[PDB]
């Protein structure tokens, strides 16, 4: 509905958790967002804000659940 692009503050929160989880846009999150939202998303900046808030919730669950194994 709202196609407002992802804002910088939300992007930064996402980047922070990706780093903490030792995950990346290219290898991990852009493929998953493309699958879940059923569209070709080639760059982090192409997410809508509404899409990014759902991705952020997921990453928070991953970072809260357990330690990141070395």
């Amino acid at each position: 509905r709202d196609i407002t692009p992802v804002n910088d503050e939300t992007m930064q929160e996402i980047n922070t958790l990706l780093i903490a989880l030792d995950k990346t846009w290219d290898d991990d999150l852009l493929p998953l967002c493309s699958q879940i939202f059923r569209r070709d998303i080639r760059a982090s900046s192409e997410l809508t804000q509404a899409e990014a808030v759902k991705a952020l919730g997921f990453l928070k669950q991953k970072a809260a659940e357990q330690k990141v194994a070395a």
């Binding site: 989880l21 991990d28 998953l32 699958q35 879940i36 759902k54 991705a55 919730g57 997921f58 990453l59």
Partner: peptide, 10 residues
Amino acid sequence: WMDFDDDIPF
């Protein structure tokens, strides 16, 4: 469908 509320591996 898979969505971001699910217990998905990452």
